[PDB]
Amino acid sequence: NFAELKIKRLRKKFAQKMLRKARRKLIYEKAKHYHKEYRQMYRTEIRMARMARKAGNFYVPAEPKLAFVIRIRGINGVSPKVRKVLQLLRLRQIFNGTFVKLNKASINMLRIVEPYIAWGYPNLKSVNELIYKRGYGKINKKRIALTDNTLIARSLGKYNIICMEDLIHEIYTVGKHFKEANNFLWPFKLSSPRGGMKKKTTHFVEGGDAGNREDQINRLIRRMN
């Protein structure tokens, strides 16, 4: 008859459209929730530090969960233990970047590749900048640019990470599926530092640009991203 046939195909197309609009609305309202979660997160430490100072006591805040690690030195003349740890972090190239979550195990791995990395505690802005500008997924072991949300949703659908704001939330607020969201992200191919380094070879404390740069890593992220 065919009047029925094309009517059914038109219905199935319209069903697929309304399913798209329903998912799209979920992306909007989760981004609005994460905004509200971040502002109350930000306000809290200013509140707790104030009420501490009013009493006359101190507020030691939480020691940070998330680190951003940049490899600064190259491939030539490197120890085998320093080699293994650098390729366990996936910093296989000069000016590669990865997020690693801080525990007891990872800090004692960081301090033995210390002169080869410049790492620190990232900002919300830096986490936004890195994952939006240099965001590539490891889809079928192929470095594919995250231009759409149907890459992240099709790969990390099982962990309820269905968009870029979900990915950035799970990275920043070190959640449950940090491992499967960090291992999804292909290591960040950063540029050379614009403005130059201070000194590559020595520690940050003694003038140089190696070792732990606590809140000062965000400045290096701007110049290499």
Partner: peptide, 8 residues
């Protein structure tokens, strides 16, 4: 400028 062995 990356440390891969191309053996395999």
């Amino acid at each position: 400028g990356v440390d891969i062995l191309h053996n395999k």
